[PDB]
Amino acid sequence: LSQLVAYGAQDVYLTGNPQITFFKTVYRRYTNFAIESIQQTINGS
Amino acid sequence: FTEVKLIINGSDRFSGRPGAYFRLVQPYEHHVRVPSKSVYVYSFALEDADSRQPNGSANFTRYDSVQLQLTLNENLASGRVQIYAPNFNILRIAAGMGGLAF
Amino acid sequence: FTSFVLMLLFTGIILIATNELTYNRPREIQYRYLPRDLDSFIRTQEMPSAIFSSM
Amino acid sequence: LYQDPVWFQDLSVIFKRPSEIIPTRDQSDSERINAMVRLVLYCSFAVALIRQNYLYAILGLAIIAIISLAYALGAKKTKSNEAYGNIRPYSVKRSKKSCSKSSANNPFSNATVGALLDNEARPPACSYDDNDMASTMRKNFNKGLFRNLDDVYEVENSQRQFYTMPVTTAAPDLTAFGQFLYGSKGKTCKE
Amino acid sequence: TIKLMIMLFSYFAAYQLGKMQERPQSQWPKAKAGQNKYMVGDWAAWKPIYMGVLGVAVLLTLLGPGGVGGGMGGMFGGGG
Amino acid sequence: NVGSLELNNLSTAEDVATLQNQLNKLAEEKHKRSTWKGLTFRIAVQDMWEALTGIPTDIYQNSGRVSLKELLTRDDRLRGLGLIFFLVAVVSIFF
């Protein structure tokens, strides 16, 4: 997290900051994941 | 003390002198105040109470043997003779590190 | 005999002076500031998508 | 962990410290090249001294450059000299054993998931003291991490917890462990 | 004497089967029972080396971006 | 849209400096081009300085225990051996 950071042209030249209307939500596209719940074994009475 | 003498490496540093000299005269001449109490002193430097400037010193690191002779009065109780010797050193500070040089 | 090696070094050292230019090979890449709006957008965004990149 | 004696190649000035070796035997390829260098240097210098024309030494240096350049450029990267298990049949001559050097993504070469990434067969991370990889490991650990400057024997940022696991390959190499506990003893009494 | 001198080296080149070399792996140390030898570092002596090591560590920290913070603030600079 | 991180600039720079990174690396580019241009064929009088740097330092390189040939000669020293051209010219004038 402490390393110097910079962007290439592909994240600057080929893009930009779109203007967003309060009332037009643009939702973020995200990674694919799933959530499970399982029991762990307890060692000790 | 009726008489006081300092001996350095077997030799007299000064001729022995009466205790009164060391109690009354020496601090008159060399320090800020005369104690008026029976405190005996001797300086190796001229005119001070630190005074924020050395006015001489005796380098005892070269004295292999130092003795001081006291001729005591005849009405003393057995006990302590507390001897102090304020001296100089070099405080040295560098790159975050402290310490005192000999 | 001696003049032979003298001329050999005479030409060889000029050859070396020609050769030496090849040694230093640094990479050049420049730095520039983000556009203000794009900079604000990047600073505002909360998720990074891809985790990290080394170049 | 497998260890080998020290050698070096003709660069620097090693060609004089273990001097008076001329021709190769049971030596590493770098040592064999060094021995050839010694042969050529002594031969050409002696020839130049016998016939004082001052050019046989030049030809000796030129052929030294030829041999060294050939060795430097023509090396074949197709080496898999990795020792594990019961057999090391690839070569029996002196050579440097393969090591998986510490990397930025894997500072301690613990083979957590790096083995499944690209290597498949990953050479063991060799000893802590073999090739100065201790300094590289410390540098890689102290990448992007700030110290409080109250510990010059740094333990404050938890060096101790991190370490190299005993095995750094996909398999524990159980055959070597068994041979360690139970020697082959060659031809035994029952045979 | 060319043919001869080269062969003299050839004869010697063949002969010196073997390879002497610098000690490999790691060097080792011997421990007195605790009488009769001087410690490697004076016990009073050991603390100073601690202290000596610090000089280097602090000097590295005179350039913040080059390493690890100090006891306050921070400092900037660079090379050339 | 993506985070790319540059680890170092030939000397590890922690992600604290902001403009020092630009100043340092601009100085790096300037030094690299200065060395390239003063190290190419086009030289005016700098041969004397290169030779005077070459001889004592070339000798001293062997005063260390070792010195790699990639560094005994290629550390701005190769044309530093250009003084041999001067000496052979001198002797050819003589001889």
Curated annotation (Swiss-Prot), chain A:
Q: What does the entry report about post-translational modification of this chain?
A: Myristoylated at the C-terminus. Glycosylated; highly branched oligosaccharides. The pattern of glycosylation sites are unusual.
Compartments where found: Virion
Please report any disulfide bonds recorded for this protein chain, giving both cysteine positions: none
State the superkingdom: Viruses
Q: Which residues cross the membrane?
A: none
Q: What induces it?
A: Expressed in the late phase of the viral replicative cycle.
Look up the further comments and give them.
Answer: The viral capsid possesses up to five major capsid protein variants. They behave as asymmetric capsid components.
Tell me, in a sentence or two, what this protein's role is. Major capsid protein self-assembles to form an icosahedral capsid with a pseudo T=169 symmetry, about 190 nm in diameter, and consisting of 1680 major capsid proteins trimers. The capsid consists in 5040 copies of the major capsid protein (hexamers), 60 copies of the penton protein (pentamers) and 1800 minor capsid proteins of different types. The minor capsid proteins form a hexagonal network below the outer capsid shell, stabilizing the capsid by binding neighboring capsomers together.
Q: Which family does it belong to?
A: Belongs to the NCLDV major capsid protein family.
Protein name (record): Major capsid protein
Q: Which organism is it from?
A: Paramecium bursaria Chlorella virus 1 (PBCV-1)
Which taxonomic lineage does the organism of this UniProt entry have? Viruses, Varidnaviria, Bamfordvirae, Nucleocytoviricota, Megaviricetes
Residue range from the parent sequence: 5 to 49 of 437
Curated annotation (Swiss-Prot), chain D:
Q: Which InterPro entries match?
A: P9_TM
* Induction behaviour: Expressed in the late phase of the viral replicative cycle.
The record's disulfide annotation reads C99-C126
Q: Which gene encodes it?
A: A407L
Q: Can you name the source organism?
A: Paramecium bursaria Chlorella virus 1 (PBCV-1)
Gene Ontology CC? membrane; viral capsid; virion membrane
Q: Which UniProt keywords apply?
A: Capsid protein, Disulfide bond, Late protein, Membrane, Transmembrane, Virion
Keyword Glycoprotein on entry = no
Q: How is it modified after translation?
A: Stabilized by 2 intramolecular disulfide bonds.
Q: What is this protein called?
A: Minor capsid protein P9
Q: What is known of its domains?
A: The transmembrane regions anchor the protein in the membrane of the underlying inner membrane.
> Self-association or partners: how does it assemble?
Interacts with the major capsid protein.
Q: What is known about what this protein does?
A: One of the minor capsid proteins that constitute a network internal to the major capsid proteins and outside the lipid membrane. The minor capsid proteins glue and stabilize the capsomers.
Subcellular location per UniProt equals:
Virion membrane
